[PDB]
Structure formats: C-alpha cells, structure tokens
Design a protein around this ligand. Structure first.
Ligand code: ANP
Ligand code: MG
Length: 277
C-alpha cells in the first residue's frame, strides 16, 4: 500500500496553479502545498483521470509507493498523496526547468562543461542511492530526469522500476537479449544519459531501426563522441558501455570520477555514424 511510504495530504493544503504536462494517468500541474509547519512550497501535482480503471489506480499509486521509499537530494521528493478524496493526487517537489532532455535541447552549446558535469554528478548520486536500496530503474534516460531552477538534476519516473517499456536505446545488450536487468544495466543506461547530456539532448542512435541499434551495439559499435566532448567523459561513456557488465564501473565509482573532474576542471580541457569500440 501507498500509505506505508506516502503521507496522506489534506487537500485544503493544496492549491493548483496551471497545467504543465500530461501523463499516462491524467494531467500534471504546478501549484503550492502548505506544510504542517505553515511553510508553503511549490509542488507538482499529478491527478488520476476521472473514470479511472482499478489497474490505472494501482499503477498510478504504485509509482508513488516506490518513490516514497527514497529520500535523497537527487531523487524526486514525494510530498504525499491524496486518496481519501477524488481526484486522487500525487504531489512531488516542483522542478522549474522540467525534463532534462527537452531543457538541454533549448540550450544547445549554452552551458559550461562544469555545469554539465554538475548535472551528471547529481544523476549519478541519485542512482548510487537507488542501487544501494536494491532497485533497478530500467528506464534511466534524460527524459526521466527533472531539473530545477538551480540546475539540480533528480531521478524521476519509477513506472518501470523493480526491486532486485523496454526502452531499447537506453537498455544494455544483456537486458535486451534476455531481460538480464541489474544495477550494471542501469550503469549502461547512465552511459547513454551521459551521451545525451553532452550532446544537448540529441536522441541516442538517432532514428536507427531498432533491430540495427540492437545488432550494432552487439557487434561492438558505440555512439560517437559528442562535439567538443572531453576525453575523460567519452572514456566514461565507453566504460559504462562495456560488453561485460562486470567490467562496468559501479555508481559509487562514477560519482567519484565526476567529483575528481569537478575538483580538477583543467582535466576537462583535453578533448576527444557509430564507432567500433
Ligand atoms: N516535479 C515536476 N516539476 C515540474 N514539472 C514536472 C514535474 N513532473 C512532471 N513535470 C512536467 O510534466 C511533464 C510530463 O510529466 P512526466 O513526469 O514526464 O510524465 P509522463 O507520463 O512521462 N509524460 P511525457 O513525458 O510527456 O510522456 C514533464 O515533461 C514536465 O515538463
Ligand atoms: Mg516523460
């Protein structure tokens, strides 16, 4: 049940401002939540459509029951849910700059490498905690990361997450071949996210036929270095994309690698069709 890991909010404490998106289960809006302390915060509010199916309700709230297990600065925060009145609602922290892929596409080549690496470090830190908690996300992609007014990136979209629909472009070869999902398949996905960020939201493998994405990666081809990509970051992508999952870095190692790059920004000044790795 969702109440094990979600607070039931009093709807009198929720105000709705405007619609900001559309989900599988209903609308997404922005608004305000008054906390018990009287503090008021901005929030995102997702509603379950009128005339929902029992399955739609279970899936909708199930994603909240996963999210509510995590309390980490780089994982979207669940403020609570409304179930005792309808529409049913999930209330999360507000992320002013929306989904990371769309945000980067609006800002091609407009951030510093250190800004991009800060975004990537945040995502890695959230993934380190998720994987520490025994969860495999399975849908780690820039479209599933939200970014706030201060450029802090946070892991979202727990619909496909499982305790230890097949987005092929983001999925490791072993997970495609026989549904071998592990934290190491999430690391592969992270490598794709790293490519997405450094490419400012370019689509991984562009619009290659899915069968060709699967075959090419199996044959050892990899996405090419994004323009002006630091060598260190392309190498990190390649490491995330090791054929043997046991050779991929752990999230903790990724976080450490990025922290070193942040501490020695001069490192990033060495700069680096699919490439056969
Ligand atoms: N916490 C949040 N803060 C601010 N905006 C949000 C938040 N959650 C979702 N949104 C906005 O709502 C949009 C859709 O929500 P999302 O979480 O992506 O659900 P979805 O079912 O995946 N819909 P879509 O991505 O459009 O297919 C996002 O792209 C954001 O622009
Ligand atoms: Mg989305």
């Amino acid at each position: 049940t969702v109440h094990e890991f979600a607070k039931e909010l009093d709807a009198t404490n929720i105000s709705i401002d405007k619609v900001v998106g559309a989900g599988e289960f209903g609308e997404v809006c922005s608004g305000r939540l008054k906390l018990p302390s009287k503090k008021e915060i901005s929030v995102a509010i997702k509603t379950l459509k009128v005339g929902y199916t029992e399955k739609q309700r279970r899936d909708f709230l199930g994603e909240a029951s996963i999210m509510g297990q995590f309390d980490h600065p780089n994982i979207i925060r669940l403020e609570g849910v409304v179930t005792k009145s309808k529409p049913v609602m999930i209330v999360t922290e507000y992320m002013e700059n929306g989904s990371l892929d769309s945000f980067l596409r609006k800002h091609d080549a407009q951030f510093t490498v250190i800004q991009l690496v800060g975004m990537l470090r945040g995502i890695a830190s959230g993934m380190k905690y998720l994987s520490d908690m025994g969860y495999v996300h399975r849908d780690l992609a820039a479209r599933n990361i939200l970014i706030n007014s201060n450029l802090v990136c946070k892991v979202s979209d727990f619909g496909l997450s499982r305790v230890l629909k097949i987005p092929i472009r983001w999925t490791s070869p072993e997970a495609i071949a026989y549904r071998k999902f592990t934290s190491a398949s999430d690391v592969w996905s992270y490598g794709i996210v790293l490519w997405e960020v450094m490419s400012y939201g370019e689509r991984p493998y562009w619009e290659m036929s899915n069968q060709d994405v699967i075959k090419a990666v199996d044959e050892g081809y990899r996405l090419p270095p994004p323009m002006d990509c630091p060598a260190a970051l392309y190498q990190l992508m390649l490491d995330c994309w090791q054929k043997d999952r046991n050779n991929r870095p752990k999230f903790e190692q990724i976080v450490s690698i990025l922290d070193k790059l942040i501490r020695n920004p001069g490192s990033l000044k060495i700069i680096t069709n699919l490439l056969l790795d």
